[PDB]
Amino acid sequence: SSSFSFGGFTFKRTSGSSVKREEEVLTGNLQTLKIRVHEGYEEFTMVGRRATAILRKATRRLIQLIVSGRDEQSIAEAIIVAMVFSQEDCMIKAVRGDLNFVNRANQRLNPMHQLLRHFQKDAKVLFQNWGVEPIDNVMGMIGILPDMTPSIEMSMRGVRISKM
């Protein structure tokens, strides 16, 4: 529809629709965020300077993410953005460390951007917590594990790389 930018990716909805509802979620380090949850199945393109992805998702669920990109960092960047954008519970529960989401004064930062900045610091716990699954052998596609190494047999749940 209208595109928007998030995490350095231009998102464009290419299919589906959603309604929104506010939910007060509880992070892994026991902070509350009031997030606008998108309810319904949707597909988006994500266009970055250094990676591209196609995301299928539903309410707080990433169903498929196909990514291409120039190097390990740029592919990881896309996966982190997509995992945050999915609003999944395992992502909310993967938050660690300082209680730095609490508003300091009258700031009212955007919770989705708060989450993104947290996981851009270090996505190791996010990726470890996300889940891995066996994959089918689809020529041209490969899996990617939580330590960012490729695998032809297993991948982070829902995620596949289209090999350059």
From Swiss-Prot:
It is found in: Virion; Host nucleus; Host mitochondrion. Signal peptide: none annotated. Plays an essential role in transcription initiation and cap-stealing mechanism, in which cellular capped pre-mRNAs are used to generate primers for viral transcription. Recognizes and binds the 7-methylguanosine-containing cap of the target pre-RNA which is subsequently cleaved after 10-13 nucleotides by the viral protein PA. Plays a role in the initiation of the viral genome replication and modulates the activity of the ribonucleoprotein (RNP) complex. Belongs to the influenza viruses PB2 family. Influenza RNA polymerase is composed of three subunits: PB1, PB2 and PA. Interacts (via N-terminus) with PB1 (via C-terminus). Interacts with nucleoprotein NP (via N-terminus). Interacts (via N-terminus) with host MAVS (via N-terminus); this interaction inhibits host innate immune response. This is Polymerase basic protein 2. It comes from Influenza A virus (strain A/Puerto Rico/8/1934 H1N1). The chain holds residues 320 to 483 of 759 of the full protein.
